[PDB]
Amino acid sequence: AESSADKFKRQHMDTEGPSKSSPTYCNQMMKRQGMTKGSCKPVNTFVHEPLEDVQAICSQGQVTCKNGRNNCHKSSSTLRITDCRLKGSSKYPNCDYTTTDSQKHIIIACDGNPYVPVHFDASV
């Protein structure tokens, strides 16, 4: 399989995407990024911020994780995010998402050495 940090880059990063996402961003990006394969991913988030800024979160205050682990960290600032969540209608392979724009703190899970981001935990 691919790096757990590369996968994250595939699934959750979009540095120069518009802060003004058109209502067709999700349907377009979820498919291009591979989250449409064997099934439609239910909920996903993209971070329109530089990787340098995201990697730095691994140095901020540590919070516990949803799976009970020690490696999660809560951002000390609000990042530009975009939520994509499936619609009631949707019938695979025709995955249909709703594009929601926002700006909340993100809780990521880091690991390894170099200690790099590996999973997206939550939005607060």
User: Experimental technique used?
Assistant: X-ray
Q: Does the annotation flag 45 for ligand binding? A: yes
| Cα 22 to Cα 57: distance, rounded to the nearest angstrom | 28
Query: Which residues is 83 bridged to in the sheet?
Result: 45, 100
Domain count, the chain: 1
* 12, containing H or E segment: helix 4-12
Domain housing 43:
1-124
Q: What is the DSSP track for 50-100?
A: -HHHHHGGGGS-EE--TTS-S-EEE-SS-EEEEEEEE-SS-BTTB--EEEE
From the list 108, 103, 107, the residue with the least C-alpha distance to 20 is 103
CATH of the domain at 70: 3.10.130.10
**DSSP one-letter code for 10:** H
User: Which strands sit side by side in the sheet containing 97-104, from one edge to the other?
Assistant: 43-47, 79-86, 97-104
| Cα 25 to Cα 115: distance, rounded to the nearest angstrom | 31
Give Cβ neighbours of residue 29 (< 8 Å, ≥ 6 apart). Answer: 14, 17, 46, 84
Q: Does the annotation flag 31 for ligand binding? A: no
Q: Does the annotation flag 37 for ligand binding? A: no
The SS3 call for residue 17 is coil
Q: Which residues are catalytic?
A: 12, 119
The answer to whether the CB of 105 falls within 8 A of the CB of 124 is yes
The SS3 call for residue 19 is coil
Q: Does the annotation flag 91 for ligand binding? A: no
| Cα 67 to Cα 70: distance, rounded to the nearest angstrom | 9
Q: Does the annotation flag 74 for ligand binding? A: no
Q: Measure the CA dihedral 95/96/99/104, to 10°.
A: -50
**DSSP one-letter code for 24:** T
